[model samples]
Target: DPDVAELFFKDDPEKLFSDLREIGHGSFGAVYFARDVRNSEVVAIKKMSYSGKQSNEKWQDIIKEVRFLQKLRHPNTIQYRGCYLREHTAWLVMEYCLGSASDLLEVHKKPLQEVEIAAVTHGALQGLAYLHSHNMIHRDVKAGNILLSEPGLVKLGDFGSASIMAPANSFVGTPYWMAPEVILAMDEGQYDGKVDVWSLGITCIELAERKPPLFNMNAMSALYHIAQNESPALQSGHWSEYFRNFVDSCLQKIPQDRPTSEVLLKHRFVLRERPPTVIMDLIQRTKDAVRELDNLQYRKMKKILFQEA
Candidate 1:
């Protein structure tokens, strides 16, 4: 672990050529698309800025992220290359995911087909299962945190806010994705990794509908809706009945009611007849989705012209 730390902080950029190209910036840090001159390999670097107002609690959260990411090894989880901490800046090196799941859906302006959603969700569940097996819980699970190497192959990222079944007063997850138990801030009941399962179910709905199942209303309004509403209406006609049922199982209000990740893996929605290799499957799905979008757009254009004529 010390060696990994040294690789991130002490490496000579003169010999190793580190060019920091800005990719995206978040509230906490700026992400750069960088090249490690030492190995001539590409990497993503998340650089965090220090502030006087930041609490020790926040710093401890950063430490948790680094420690957990260093030990976590799974094909579906984002790979943590290393990290560097200097005076007022902290840098995290990770495997570069060319695109994020939310980016793809927003840019394309089309819902993911059932097969595409199944493939992506399967990989995410596998990663979550691995985390839970290790007795760790990823508190945040959303489309924005799921990065795609391709259509079907997604790597779960952003472990900075993750916690291990610890006690807390405030809710930790994004409001839109938070489970009813989390929203209510139930102190008597135990909250576990099932929170992630609930969040993932919400993500599946987002991917299929190209919008959140609930409206992007104010935080209080959204929380009220989540707590009061038993179930969000599933966009049934857009997806196959099998896929709809699988999603419904995950969205069950009771944590115990939700299917475990292991169970979800065996479900018909995810298990392909002739399992194509992960990359090939992703490529095929992307191609098919694009073709469908193109055809739909052409038909829409034709209808518009016909009405005018």
Candidate 2:
């Protein structure tokens, strides 16, 4: 541990952050809920495995990109503290969020209300506005990337998917949220920040319907549909007119016609009054629901064990 590399800090990451428990896992790495000992700050540390076949050269690029991420500062975006390398693993320290919007839906087993969706969309838009101002694009904008704190604050996470350059020509990001320009970028078509706006539109649909449009279709088929057909819309939600209008503004087939993040921030859908306790309530409900389910499963297992005995 003492010999492991530190990208940004001199302190030992194992001692710096205490109580590491895995909260999630993804392609990036395994995320742990931790607490910084110095300030007693709650944090999330993503431990990235670094001994893959191509890690020698590929990891250098990732370290450089993560260093770039440390410079970004915004309330609506996840705060990156620093990173540490130990035993061929890079531990990335970040401000901890209780759960993501997708987690909320998974636990609640239902779609979010209009007000909640508006609140999250506003927060994500704020982050996107900040990113776009600096010529950065969060190529992946989906419900899964919208993280929430305990007291109702929303922040966008998973910046690993963001493109470092503008006028991006390569294809990246999830197919469901990919803009038509991005889907078509394998051709001569290029894309910019407006691609995120299109994904944001799809994210709104995800929040309202518990899944993005064309959930039943294959990813490649969905991409083809998105590129060739009309922009996807909500099929069964009784959403507000302003909400629908806001989505339409983001889903314009032409990237140039799509509203900028700053402009969309002023849209009536995002400007609505979100009750202070709305997200807090939703979080509590989700926690209780999950706990209840776990208990029920435990009880069932106990009964089966007793019968076997």
Candidate 3:
């Protein structure tokens, strides 16, 4: 028996038109937060331009995103609610996550513990495994595209940059986060989704350190450095040698030399369990520190307001 999936928006078009709220924007589209009028559920909508000669390419990419998401079902993967094309715009509705992984790391300055990393890494790997199984490769895998709904619930998002693993030459991805093989602009079909695993390893380091291992630089410079360098230096003192070694294996210059997500999951560092109390304590401390910073910001704002009055 097939379960009827919910429509991208509620049946009422009027309600749908009224509920859209702008959230973010990118080169190709602007994102909105919309409410399903019939069910009163929230969804994120990305509206893409549909004019000019590139319109056909845009349409195809939009269709690819929908198809890729439709076939995927995992805790770590974002849900595809629905999509609609009208006039000169494409509306893609999807699950609305509370925040992106990059936003949380940068704004909150929170460092993830080994256990917390395992939970998130496991979810992300599971999502990648699913995508790889379907013969799709998410060329761009980075903290910005990974959304976090709850503390440990991480979901992969943004398939706009994804491509089928068929051979063709055209490399595209965020420079610092891309795998070395991808940097070379090798034929797309020749590279498997294992490139994602390499990106995931870098993502782990970013989560632990609250910054990418590479210095903040221009995209070209970053790509050049990665392509020329042997391995990224492990700067985060909190990580264990096992963790460093594991990431090093994934970041190997050779794509075939990289371990699959499944193999990485079985590593001693990821498989080991930490004491619940220790995990709880770390979470609580991080929360408290965030609260303290919030209070300071509030007081500063209040003081300025009072002075202005």
Candidate 4:
């Protein structure tokens, strides 16, 4: 590897990595699944355009985010490969992942088995432990941010809403997954990494029941319910005692009452073991579903063309 530090200054992004296809989009940019021309390594590149009047501010924000990403080095967390500047666009290259847990749910059209959720929770907690230890809070923790890659690796991605030294009263995160403390903090309050624990609990429920509580409610209504109601649970599932307890501990009304990611790692629910094969199987089915849908859409398009002619 030729000096990774030097790679940060690379301006000829197209020369280094070839674009394959756009895979997803983040808050600030469009992400593309790409390959390194030098080594044919698979990677994801997020392109951010900074051509408007606020270019200077956006550039500063990009650099700040990239530097933050560079400091994080954990297997369970998404890897930041390098960054590139091509005129007014920023190319942020990161480790390629197969898809998100949300994608899995969409394809499967059902709740994940408890065992599968346990496995995901384990890897995700490991990432949170690392982040919390570093005094960083992942404000946004949900199924969509839980990325699954090949060879059965589950990682936590997306740091747009994360804060290294989050101030009190900062309003950030999805309403459905927002912890009571986070919602209350909207006016005046403080929180730490425990906010992530709350979202993690919501994610577990999402995995079990295929959606979080108050899914039918509007954002403001969900926020109110999360702040006022008892913590959400698996409303109609035969969940294990350990699983229920694990979520209970995570969804405590008070952030201080919630167990830390480190503590939760030792919970009985998270300690369960299962082969990665189950996760791989899900990935396989999801890919099959996507392929089949693509073919069907193409056939429909062809039929429409014939009818028009």
Clash counts per candidate, in order, are 1, 0, 4, 0
Runs of candidate 2 exceeding 4 Å displacement: 1-6, 296-309
lDDT of 4 by residue, 66-139 (tens): 87888899999999987987778878889888778887787678988888889888889999999998988888
* Per-model TM-score on C-alpha atoms: 0.82, 0.90, 0.80, 0.89
Q: Which parts of model 4 are misplaced by more than 4 Å?
A: 1-7, 166-168, 292-309
Between 3 and 4, whose lDDT is larger? 4
**N/CA/C clash count, model 1:** 1
lDDT of 1 by residue, 1-309 (tens): 453453445644334437676667776678777777767777788877655477455555556667777788898998898777666556778887655677657545787666767777887888898887777778788888887763346788888667755433347788888887777774554576777888888888888887776656987788888877876746668677777887788889987888777678788877755355654455445445544555554432221111112
lDDT of 1 at 293: 58
Superior by TM-score: candidate 2 or candidate 3: 2
lDDT of each: 0.71, 0.81, 0.68, 0.81
Candidate 3, residue 228: lDDT: 78
Per-residue accuracy of model 2 over 145-199 as CA lDDT, tens digit each: 9898866788888887787778788888898999999989978878889999999
The TM-score obtained by model 1 is: 0.82
Model 2 weakest 10-residue run by lDDT: 300-309
Q: Compared with the true structure, what per-residue lDDT tens digits does model 3 show for residues 15-57?
A: 4644665666887679876676767676787887767567778
Cα lDDT over the full model 1: 0.71
Best-to-worst TM-score order: 2, 4, 1, 3
